Structure 1
C-alpha cells in the first residue's frame, strides 16, 4: 500500500562498544550553575575527570559567554570536545515561559561557541530525553526537546557538532566508560543512548505494514477536541472524524470562529450530522482550556485530542535565533501540550494525538526552534505511554492542498529536498493505519530518497538513514 509506504518509525539499534581510552586532549564541560546537582550530572563530571575544564553558563547572555569562552580557549588552546550538561536545567526561563532554561542555554552555547571560535565538537548530554530499547522509560520530555535542536545544529554547523547522548538512570562505571569512549571516537554515530545492555543508536526505518484491528482503535464517538481545528490539516482531520462518527467536534484556534474558512468548515461538518463548537482559545492558556472542557455535554464526554495548533514562521538559523523567537515557537507545542496532558490525564481518553514534524524527526536547516518544539511532542507521547496513558505523535512530512506548505516559498524548499507533498487523503489514511495499530510514534511522509539522502548527507554522514534501504541505495 501507498499509505503503508508513507509511514516510518524511529528505532534504536545496538552499535559497537567504544574504545577504553579517554580522549587525549582536554574536554570543556559546560554546567548550568543552578541545575548542577542531579545525580547524572555529578556522575558525568566525575567521569570526565578532574583535568576537564569547567565552564558555568550563567543566565542567558550570548556576548558575555562568547567573551568567557574566548578566554578559556586562549589559555588552553584547542579542546578535544565540548560536553554540555545544560539539559539538566528543566525549569522554565524567567523571561520566556515556554522555553526550558537548558534549551535556551544550549542555543546560546552553540551561538557563543561559534562567536568565540571554539571548534571542538559539541556533545549535548540528556537523561531520559529519549525512549531507547525495550521497556525504556522517557522520563523527561523537556530534555527531549533538546534533541530536536541538536539535530538542526548538526545540519547547520556539522563541523563543530559532536552529537547527542542520553545517559541511563544510574551512571555506573560501565556507563561512564561508554560515555568517555564515545567522546574519544563515536564511529560516526551522533544520536546515541547509553543503557545497561549496551550503547544504542537512532535509526529511521519503514514502519510495519498495516494490520486491521491490531491496536483495537475504539470507534470515534463523544466529543473530540481538535486544536488548530480551523487550520489546514486540522479541518481535514475534523471532516474525517465527522465521517467516522464523532458526536461533537470542538475546534479551537486563536481566531476561532473568525479564522479563515471557518463558516464553510462548520457547514460542511454539520451537513454530516455533527455538533460543532468553534472556539477562540489559545492552546497555551490553561484557564481557557479548562473552561472549554468544563462546558462539554454530559452525553458527549471528551474521548480524544488531536493537537494540530502550531506555527512554523519566524524561526531562524541556529546562529541567529533569539529567545523571543524560540518562545513564540514553543508556545503552541510545549506549553499547550503540557496543559492538554495535565487536564486529560484523568479522563481515560481513547486517543491523544500530537502533530509533530519531519523537522523534529530528521532535522531541517533553518528551523531549530520548530524542531525543538516538535521534538517535545514526540517525547511527551512516549512519556505518557510510560504512565499507562494513551498517546501518539505523528511527525508529518509535507502536506499538499491545505496547510502551511501551500506556499511556493515553503512548498518549494521541502519538495526540492525530496520531502514531497502528500495528498491529504493518503496522509489521513496513513494516520488511521497508525491509530488502528495503536503505535506511539511515526513519521508520515512521502520521500524521494534519491533526492533526499545525498542532499541530507552532503557535509556529514547520517547513521540515522542507514536503515532505509532506499537511502543506502541512493548513496551507493
Structure 2
C-alpha cells in the first residue's frame, strides 16, 4: 500500500508573494494572433502592458517570415525586457493541421523564430483558464492548457530565453493588471503562475495523500468498458485488470485492431477470465467510427467507463526543429480523440473517464515538446470535465516496465539516467486503483530517484515546482 502511495504525486497551487509595483524598465514586445485578439482578456492585457509596448501581429504560420520580421523589429526597436505572447487566445484548429490549435502552432513557431532572429528577451506565454489554480477554480479552456505542456519543454530546452507561463483570471481588473506587470518586472524565480482575485499562485508538485482502504467513491467495475489503444502494452494490462475486477465486456481499439501484435493472445487471456471481448480497428480520432462503436453496444452491457490509452511518442523533435506536421501526428490520438470521447459520452453518466497522460506533460521533458503538449491537453480536459459535473481522471505515467513504449533498452537507459525509473506493472496499476478509489481528478504515477532527477532537472535553471517535494529539496541542498 505505502509503496504504491509513494508513486502518486499531484499538482497543487500555493500562494506566492505579491509582486512589486513598478513596470519593467525596458520595452515589452507583445505578440498577438490577429484573427483572435478580440477576447476581453487579450484587450485587458494589451491595455495593462501600456502603449509603449511594441506589437507584433503573428500572421499565419510562417517561421521564416516571422524570423525576418522579428529580426527587423530588433534592429529598429532595439532590445526588449521580455516578449509577452497572447497567441493562446487562438483556440480554433489550424486549417491544415486539424489536431493542432492555431495558438499552439503559432507559439511553437514564435519560440523558433525568436531563436532564429537572436531576440533573447524572455518569452512569457499568457493563457486564460488553461489551468485550475486553487480550490473551486474552473479550467475553462483545455485547449489553452495544452500550451503549458509545450511551455515547460521550452523552459527545459531554451532555459535562458524562457520566461514562463501565467494564467489570467476571467476579469483582468487593475489588481490583476498590476500583478501581471509586476511579475514581468520580476517573478521571484517563479515561472508557472496563476493570477486570481485572491492573489498570485504558483504551481507545485507534491506527494499525494495516502490511499484509504474503505475509501468508497468508486463503483464496481461492470458492463462494457472501452480501452482505446487496448491492444497496446499498458492498455492490454489495464484490460486484464478490468477483466479481473468484473467487467462484462471489454472493447479494445487501435488502428491495427485484431491484427495488432499479440491481439489473439490478449483476447484468449481475457476470454479465459469469462469476459466478452471486442477488438475493433479504429483511429481514435475518427469521430464517426467511435459513434458507430458506441451505437453497437449490448443493451445488457452499457458503457460504464473509458480508459484512453491510445497514443504515440515517436517522431517528436526539439522545439527548434519540430514541424507542424509532426505536432499534428502527436496531437491526433490525444486532443482530437479525447475531445470526441468527451463529447460522445458526455450524456452516458460514466463511472470513470480515464485519460493516460505523461510526466512529460506534468514536469516536462527535453526533446518531447509535441508529446508534452498533447498530454497536457488530457490533464486539462480532466479538470475541465469536473467543472461540468462529469467524472474524469488524468493519470500522468512516469515509466512502465515490462510492456509498452519504454521497453526499448535505449529509451529505458536514458530514462533511468534522468531518474525516472521503470515501474512494475502491478505497482503502477495498484497505484491507479488507489487514485480511482480516491476519485482524484489528476495525478502523476511515477517511481522517481529524486537524488538523480532533481539535479538533472535543475542543472540549467531552478524549479519552484519541485520545492514542495522534500526529497528534491534534500538532493539539491
TM-score tier, shorter chain, comes to over 0.9
Q: Deviations over 1:64-110 (max 9, x none)?
A: 00000000101111100000000000000000000000000000000
Q: CA deviation at 1:314?
A: 0.2
- Matches of 1:340 and 1:400, distance apart in 2: 28
Q: 2:92: which partner in 1?
A: 91
Q: 2:247: which partner in 1?
A: 246
Q: Deviations over 1:185-235 (max 9, x none)?
A: 000000000000000000000000001243510000000000000000000
395-404 or 212-221, larger mean C-alpha shift: 212-221
Q: 2:237 is paired with a residue of what secondary structure?
A: helix
Segments of 5+ residues of structure 1 without an aligned counterpart are none
Per the alignment, do residues 215 and 99 of structure 1 end up closer, same or farther by CA in structure 2, a change over 3 Å counting?
Answer: farther
- Matches of 1:232 and 1:439, distance apart in 2: 24
- Matches of 1:465 and 1:213, distance apart in 2: 31
Q: 2:183: which partner in 1?
A: 182
- Matches of 2:24 and 2:241, distance apart in 1: 55
Q: 1:192 is paired with a residue of what secondary structure?
A: strand
Q: 1:405 is paired with a residue of what secondary structure?
A: helix
Q: CA deviation at 1:391?
A: 0.2
Q: CA deviation at 1:414?
A: 1.1
Q: 2:31 is paired with a residue of what secondary structure?
A: strand
- Matches of 2:415 and 2:187, distance apart in 1: 30
- Matches of 1:268 and 1:289, distance apart in 2: 25
Q: TM-score, normalised by structure 1?
A: 1.00
68-77 or 300-309, larger mean C-alpha shift: 68-77
Q: 1:56: which partner in 2?
A: 57
- Matches of 1:215 and 1:316, distance apart in 2: 43
Matched length: 476
Q: Deviations over 1:333-366 (max 9, x none)?
A: 0000000000000000000000000000000000
Say yes or no: does 1:325 pair with 2:348.
no
Q: CA deviation at 1:156?
A: 0.1
- Matches of 1:403 and 1:272, distance apart in 2: 22
Q: CA deviation at 1:413?
A: 1.1
Q: Deviations over 1:169-197 (max 9, x none)?
A: 00000000000000000000000000000
CA RMSD of aligned residues (A): 0.4
Q: Deviations over 1:394-436 (max 9, x none)?
A: 0000000000000012111111100000000000000000000
Q: Deviations over 1:365-411 (max 9, x none)?
A: 00000000000000000000000000000000000000000001211
- Matches of 1:195 and 1:15, distance apart in 2: 12
Give yes or no for contact 1:234–1:308 (8 Å, CA) kept in 2: yes
Q: 1:108: which partner in 2?
A: 109
Q: Deviations over 1:111-144 (max 9, x none)?
A: 0000000000000000000000010000000000
Q: 2:231: which partner in 1?
A: 230
Q: CA deviation at 1:46?
A: 0.1
Give yes or no for contact 1:318–1:368 (8 Å, CA) kept in 2: yes
Q: 2:455: which partner in 1?
A: 454
- Matches of 1:4 and 1:165, distance apart in 2: 31
Q: CA deviation at 1:238?
A: 0.2
- Matches of 2:17 and 2:217, distance apart in 1: 38
- Matches of 2:140 and 2:54, distance apart in 1: 29
Per the alignment, do residues 447 and 183 of structure 1 end up closer, same or farther by CA in structure 2, a change over 3 Å counting?
Answer: same
- Matches of 2:55 and 2:214, distance apart in 1: 54
Give yes or no for contact 1:213–1:437 (8 Å, CA) kept in 2: no
Q: 1:299: which partner in 2?
A: 300
Q: CA deviation at 1:34?
A: 0.2
Q: 1:276 is paired with a residue of what secondary structure?
A: strand
Give yes or no for contact 1:257–1:278 (8 Å, CA) kept in 2: yes
- Matches of 1:347 and 1:61, distance apart in 2: 42
Q: 1:385: which partner in 2?
A: 386
Which aligned runs of 4 or more in structure 1 are off by greater than 2 angstroms?
212-215
Q: 1:138: which partner in 2?
A: 139
- Matches of 2:466 and 2:177, distance apart in 1: 28
Q: 1:54 is paired with a residue of what secondary structure?
A: strand
Per the alignment, do residues 433 and 121 of structure 1 end up closer, same or farther by CA in structure 2, a change over 3 Å counting?
Answer: same
- Matches of 1:168 and 1:470, distance apart in 2: 33
Q: 1:92 is paired with a residue of what secondary structure?
A: coil
Segments of 5+ residues of structure 2 without an aligned counterpart are none
Give yes or no for contact 1:220–1:245 (8 Å, CA) kept in 2: yes
Q: 2:227 is paired with a residue of what secondary structure?
A: strand
